[PDB]
């Protein structure tokens, strides 16, 4: 009997004032939250933000919407959401969000006989996440999502995670290319501004960066060029054109690699680990070039001393490079 | 009782003309402003602007909205803001702005018994900031936000910072990697256009650029290449291949640095400090190469003169480079 359902729904929305919260003038209305994380698409060091898609569900109670004589949950057309009171929930650290609207607005309204309202949205949000890149690419980050009421203070509304630590689902399915999600945490607290105290829910993830891409992409070319630079020490000192060609080629390749690396990061004012390694390699190749320049300078009158310098450089450079690598990989791991 | 408040608000909005400002036809209405800065996402020299996110709060008194019998302040659902008069405040130097709208429009309306309205918005605006880059990267910028009334002249409306020096908070939340905030300033004034005089608030920040990255990545390579270019003065002039290789390498490396580094800024017509420094280093290395060319040209008929020229160049070039550096760093610091 759809006519009785229609009459009941018309009666529920008769004289209903959406300007007033449930239990207006009385105790705060409690709103429970749930989130299903569909995906975490892109994490950007350049923009210091991440994108996240989720199903966001709010549960509350509105005694003006209690009905009797119909033993069913009432799933209503989402446009009814424009005729009801809903919480003014927002995300504090977001930069650009939207609700999906194909084929219709991705919104759900479900009434229960006792007056309980379930209100669901599907949201894609970009959110700010400040990152500490001092140990990049061996770094670990903590990215949060902050959920707050905008207009209502703690005297009007209260938030709580519905189900405790089970209120956020789908985190274990997330696969990220550059990161892995070590842990996620849920917090509830109060925040005081000049206009009063407001409820706050926090959902935080800890991300650890995978190292394999940087081993394959930047560390190996630098190591291989540095090793290539040592072949000069095994060439006779009278082949001036070859060894000068080696020095020039190695310096040019170092500059090209450095530019291609730095063209992908923000202009931070401190030294990163990869910067330290690359300038170590540059120092090594420059020292090899200067050593050859010295040997070529003094070899005309003292060939034996030049040969001795080359022979000792055959040994010293690998040893010092191994020591530098040991120190670097012990300071960062 | 919810029905009593419902009928009170219905009486308040009955006969309310939204087309008329408070005290229309009488004394001007005073609007107090507050700004809570959440972040400055980015500052772009290429686009000559910066992105700011803030809570913008406006305070005024509308006697038509006064109510009695309820000793409470009514925090209303923000949709009621579509039925009230609000100031036509705009930002003159903004280029693209939006109010955040997830999960609902980030808007707040609070009424007080005597008729005071508090109206809050969460706004992200990209505002223009014309930059003088003559001292770049040692430059200091001043970026402003201009708040004005569009339609109402000084006869209709007045603006003032509510709280004086404390009207803007959250300045310590501004975290820019490439800048630091030195000072912020609040200004109130009037601006005359051909349609009349309008109130104007101004919020300005002074940004100081951090020099560490440019010291690390630009100045040191030029200094090191100039010093390497000085090694030719200490080499005997019979080593034509070695000295020619040194000069060519220094010249080409300077050109490569300039081409691969300067191509990253707006096409300003004037010369920046870093441009003048790089051109000075290029001039020095080119003059060293030209000096060697002349010495090689003349040394077969006047060896003593060539030796004297090299001996004096050894002393003169470092001295003039030190003088150039002293003048540059005194002028720009």
């Amino acid at each position, epitope marked *: 009997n759809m006519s009785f359902v229609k009459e009941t729904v018309d009666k529920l929305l008769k004289g209903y004032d959406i300007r007033l919260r449930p239990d207006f003038g009385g105790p705060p209305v409690c709103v429970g939250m749930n989130i299903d994380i569909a995906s975490i698409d892109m994490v950007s060091e350049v923009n210091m933000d991440y994108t996240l898609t989720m199903y966001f569900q709010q549960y509350w109670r509105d005694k003006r919407l209690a009905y009797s004589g119909i033993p069913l949950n009432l799933t209503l057309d989402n446009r009814v959401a424009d005729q009801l009171w809903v919480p003014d929930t927002y995300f*504090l*650290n977001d930069k650009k969000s939207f609700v999906h609207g194909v084929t219709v607005k991705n919104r759900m309204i479900r009434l229960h006989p006792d007056g309980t309202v379930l209100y669901g949205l599907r949201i894609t949000t970009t959110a700010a996440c400040m990152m*500490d890149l001092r140990r990049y690419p061996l770094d670990e980050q903590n990215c949060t999502l902050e959920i707050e009421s905008y207009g209502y203070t703690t005297d009007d509304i209260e938030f709580y995670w519905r189900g405790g630590d089970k209120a956020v689902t789908g985190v274990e399915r997330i696969e990220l290319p550059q990161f892995s999600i070590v842990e996620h945490r849920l917090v509830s607290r*109060n925040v*005081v*501004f000049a206009t009063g105290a407001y409820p706050r829910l926090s959902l935080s993830f800890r991300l650890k960066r995978n190292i394999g891409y940087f081993i394959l992409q930047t560390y190996m070319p630098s190591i291989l060029i540095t090793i290539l630079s040592w072949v000069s020490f095994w060439i006779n000192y009278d082949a001036s054109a070859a060894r000068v060609a080696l020095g020039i080629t190695t310096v040019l390749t170092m500059t090209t690699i450095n530019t291609h690396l730095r063209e992908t990061l923000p202009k931070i004012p401190y030294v990163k680990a990869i910067d330290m390694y690359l300038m170590g390699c540059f120092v090594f190749v420059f020292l090899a070039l200067l050593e050859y320049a010295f040997v070529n300078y003094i070899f005309f009158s003292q060939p034996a001393r030049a040969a001795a310098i080359d022979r000792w450089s055959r040994i010293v450079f690998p040893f010092t490079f191994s020591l530098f690598n040991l120190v670097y990989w012990l300071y960062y791991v | 009782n919810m029905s009593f408040v419902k009928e009170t608000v219905d009486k308040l909005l009955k006969g309310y003309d939204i087309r008329l400002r408070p005290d229309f036809g009488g004394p001007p209405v005073c609007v107090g402003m507050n700004i809570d800065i959440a972040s400055i996402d980015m500052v772009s020299e290429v686009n000559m602007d910066y992105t700011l996110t803030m809570y913008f709060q406006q305070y005024w008194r509308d006697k038509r909205l006064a109510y009695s019998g309820i000793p409470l302040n009514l925090t209303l659902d923000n949709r009621v803001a579509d039925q009230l008069w609000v100031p036509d405040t705009y930002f003159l130097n903004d280029k693209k702005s939006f109010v955040h709208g997830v999960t609902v429009k980030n808007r707040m309306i609070r009424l007080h018994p005597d008729g005071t309205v508090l109206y809050g918005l969460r706004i992200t605006t990209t505002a223009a900031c014309m930059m003088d880059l003559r001292r770049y990267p040692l430059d200091e910028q001043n970026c402003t936000l201009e708040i004005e009334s569009y339609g109402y002249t000084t006869d209709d409306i007045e603006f003032y910072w509510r709280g004086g020096d404390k009207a803007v*908070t959250g300045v*310590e939340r*501004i975290e820019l990697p490439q800048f*630091s905030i030195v000072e912020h300033r609040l200004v109130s004034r009037n601006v005359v256009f051909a349609t009349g005089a309008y109130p104007r608030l101004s919020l300005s920040f002074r940004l100081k650029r951090n020099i560490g990255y440019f010291i690390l990545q630009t100045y040191m390579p030029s200094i090191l290449i100039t010093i390497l270019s000085w090694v030719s003065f200490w080499i005997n002039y019979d080593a034509s291949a070695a000295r020619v290789a040194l000069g060519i390498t220094t010249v080409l490396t300077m050109t490569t640095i300039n081409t691969h580094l300067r191509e990253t800024l707006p096409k300003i017509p004037y010369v920046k400090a870093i441009d003048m420094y790089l051109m000075g280093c290029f001039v020095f290395v080119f003059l060293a190469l030209l000096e060697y060319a002349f010495v090689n040209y003349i040394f077969f008929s006047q060896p003593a003169r060539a030796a004297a020229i090299d001996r004096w160049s050894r002393i003169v070039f470092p001295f003039t480079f030190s003088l150039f550096n002293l003048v540059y760093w005194l002028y720009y610091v």
Partner: nanobody
Amino acid sequence: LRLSCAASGHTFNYPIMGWFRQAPGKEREFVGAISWSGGSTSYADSVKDRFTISRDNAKNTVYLEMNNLKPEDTAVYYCAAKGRYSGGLYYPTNYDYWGQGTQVT
């Protein structure tokens, strides 16, 4: 007189340090706040131009220098850390990690 607050651990997640003082009969009172990186200080009215706050990241320390003391500056002093999205700068509820109380007469 000079008070030093040295912080260790995850100082990146708590980029703001604040100073408070508790009187024997009054509640906790905000004194000043300092940003670890930006070095942008903020002060309460009662200690403007008299107290100064400085930060050094070398050993992660913040210094409160107190000058021109008064008998109304006899309170137990605390240092605290504030989260990145913790709200207003003047409210003790918004500060998570509190140091040990220090007495000044």
